[PDB]
Design a protein around this ligand. Structure first.
Ligand SMILES: Oc1c2ccccc2nc2nnnn12
Ligand SMILES: [Zn+2]
Length: 357
């Protein structure tokens, strides 16, 4: 069980130093763009958001690829749920003096996301040309992705920060009461929420004016504070395998994606799908005793088992938005699910050969 798994884990951990050697060139580009971005009136309150695999300590087989996020607060905003999606909204303002920096981006009462990102990419594109230390290139649209020294890639995302209360669609979400207590849940919900630009699927087109809720910052917190016990993983007697199981789940999918990249079945699947399923497993298994380090094998099998159940039943609720099904028949087709299902079941039945691969 754990024998082959922890062996894999040991291998992945060895990619520590290499992920930091390049971060120097990254930290340079990011800091440069932030200065020039603050120059523009609209992107004044722009700032780094310390949420991601970099800060969460969970990055696997993607050392060259980096992911950053730029948050921009929006003091007074009104949100409009789009087509009862429960996860996508419009950005309508409610300020007393209608003179906010985003004025130029408005397309009526609604805030244009397509135009918002246009200026964002526009500034970034113009900024990279300046620096002459390391050759930086902006990748074609297909939101901004940079290529540093032809070896390193950075995915820059723009998020709106609303320190207001979380939308009523999240009310029944984040079921961590029995796991992390109700006191913590109330605390976390007091934290702000973020909005990332993502169009919605429609018959003959997309909706390029919608934003999706983002709670990545909460996810980071929850992962670096995973135990029911406050001293979880702080002593030999209380060491668990929560973080290990997530890392393994992630790596498994990435491998299957890397293996079948040519066909493009798993192209729609993402690490978030795996992270979501994991959080649901944590809720199901609230006790630290259920995540004993000596039970890595058995614990990991549960995750795999649950993830498979989500694929078969085509049901995977957003951990914060219960009515949002990441695995909806419309979002992902049954065939693509049956394929990933088939592959994963094979791996489990053959002591996961995809790991040494
Ligand atoms: O990053 C994400 C999300 C982030 C926040 C909320 C829902 C999401 N749903 C997603 N499906 N694929 N990626 N992905
Ligand atoms: Zn722990």
């Amino acid at each position: 069980g754990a024998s082959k798994l922890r062996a894999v884990l040991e291998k992945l951990k060895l990619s520590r130093d290499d992920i930091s050697t390049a971060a120097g060139m990254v930290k340079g580009v990011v800091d440069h763009l932030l200065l020039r971005l603050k120059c523009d009136s609209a992107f004044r309150g722009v700032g780094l958001l310390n949420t991601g695999s970099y800060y969460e300590h969970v990055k696997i087989s993607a050392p060259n690829e980096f992911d950053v996020m730029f948050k921009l607060e929006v003091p007074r905003i009104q949100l409009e749920e789009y087509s009862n999606t429960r996860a996508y909204y419009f950005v309508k303002f409610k300020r007393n003096p209608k003179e906010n920096p985003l004025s130029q981006f408005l397309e009526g009462e609604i805030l244009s996301a397509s135009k918002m990102l246009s200026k964002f990419r526009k500034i970034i594109k113009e900024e990279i040309n300046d620096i002459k230390d390391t050759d930086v290139i902006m990748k074609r649209k297909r939101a901004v992705t940079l290529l540093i020294s032809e070896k390193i890639s950075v995915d820059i995302t723009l998020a709106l920060e609303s320190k207001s209360s979380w939308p009523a669609s999240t009310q029944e979400g984040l079921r961590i009461q029995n796991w992390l207590s109700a006191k913590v849940r109330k605390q976390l919900r007091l934290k702000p929420f973020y909005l990332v630009p993502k169009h919605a699927k429609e018959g003959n087109g997309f909706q390029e004016e919608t934003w999706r809720l983002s709670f990545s910052h909460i996810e980071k917190e929850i992962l670096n504070n995973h135990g029911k016990s406050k001293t979880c993983c702080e002593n030999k007697e209380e060491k668990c395998c929560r973080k290990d199981c997530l890392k393994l789940m992630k790596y498994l999918l990435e491998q299957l994606k890397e293996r079948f990249k040519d066909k493009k079945h798993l192209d729609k699947f993402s690490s978030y799908h795996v992270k979501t399923a994991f959080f649901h497993v944590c809720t199901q298994n609230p006790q630290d005793s259920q995540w004993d380090r000596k039970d890595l094998g058995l614990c990991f099998d549960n995750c795999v088992t649950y993830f498979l159940q989500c694929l078969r039943t085509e049901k995977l609720e957003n951990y914060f938005i219960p009515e949002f099904n990441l695995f909806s028949s419309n979002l992902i087709d049954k065939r693509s699910k049956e394929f990933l299902t088939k592959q994963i079941e094979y791996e489990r039945n053959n002591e996961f050969p995809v790991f040494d691969e």
